[PDB]
């Protein structure tokens, strides 16, 4: 099976069982999905920036993204709800583990003046948000084939009830948290 899923089952689960003393394996947190988002605030006025985001996400995630849109509202330069504002791709299963394994071992360390990732960016519901400054850290991206360096966000959704349990799950999986 996938290297990281094996580490999860053989090392992480028993470690979480010991760390939180769950009643059974069914209560142990797992990563459920990883949502890779590339905001293109404009996109409406710059169709090409959205197109680039869509292609780069396809390269980064090995899966086709979906366009994200603005939610209901009042003001926003008149006209707003429904306008494209970026693109996202949600990974599950084997592809999700492959992506995270590479993210942890290859991409994140390649970040400019890398000093580890934030231990604080959790949403209070057990999910981790990783703000990425430059999409260039992904080996699937080639600077010479992109219109420009840009950032993105990666949300790692877990089945943990709390940030504390999700953080331990991610640390045990190898997430290079700042220290």
| C-alpha to C-alpha distance for 44 and 118, rounded to whole angstroms | 32
Total residues belonging to the chain: 179
From the list 70, 94, 78, the residue with the least C-alpha distance to 6 is: 94
- Across the beta sheet with 152-158, what order do the strands follow? 66-69, 84-91, 31-39, 152-158, 127-132
**Which three-class secondary structure state does DSSP give residue 115?**
coil
We find that the CATH architecture of domain 1-179 is 2-Layer Sandwich (3.30)
CB-neighbour burial class of residue 51 (10 A; exposed 0-12, middle 13-18, buried 19+): middle
| 158 backbone dihedrals φ, ψ, rounded to 5° | -115, 170
Task: Please give the resolution of this entry in Å, rounded to 1 decimal.
Answer: 1.8
**Which three-class secondary structure state does DSSP give residue 61?**
helix
From the list 91, 79, 123, 90, the residue with the least C-alpha distance to 2 is: 91
Angle at which helix 163-173 crosses helix 13-20, to 10 degrees, equals 140
What kind and span of H or E run contains 179? none
| 70 backbone dihedrals φ, ψ, rounded to 5° | -65, 145
Beta pairing partners, 39: 86
């Amino acid at each position: 099976m996938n290297r990281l899923k094996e580490k999860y089952l053989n090392e992480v689960v028993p470690a979480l069982m010991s760390k939180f003393n769950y009643k059974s394996i069914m209560q142990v947190p797992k990563i459920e999905k990883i949502v890779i988002n590339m905001g293109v605030g404009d996109a409406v006025q710059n169709p090409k920036a959205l197109d680039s985001a869509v292609e780069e996400l396809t390269l980064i995630a090995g899966q086709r993204p979906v366009v994200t849109r603005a939610k209901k509202s009042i003001a926003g330069f008149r006209l707003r709800q429904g306008m494209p504002i970026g693109a996202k791709v949600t990974l599950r299963g084997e592809r999700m583990y492959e992506f995270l394994d590479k993210l942890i071992s290859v991409s994140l360390p390649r970040a400019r003046d890398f000093r580890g990732v934030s231990k604080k960016s959790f949403d209070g519901r057990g999910n981790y948000t990783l703000g990425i400054k430059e999409q260039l850290i992904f080996p699937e991206i080639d600077y010479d084939k992109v219109n420009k360096v840009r950032g993105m966000d990666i949300v790692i959704v877990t089945t943990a009830n709390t940030d504390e349990e999700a953080r331990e799950l991610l640390a045990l999986l190898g997430m290079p948290f700042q220290k």
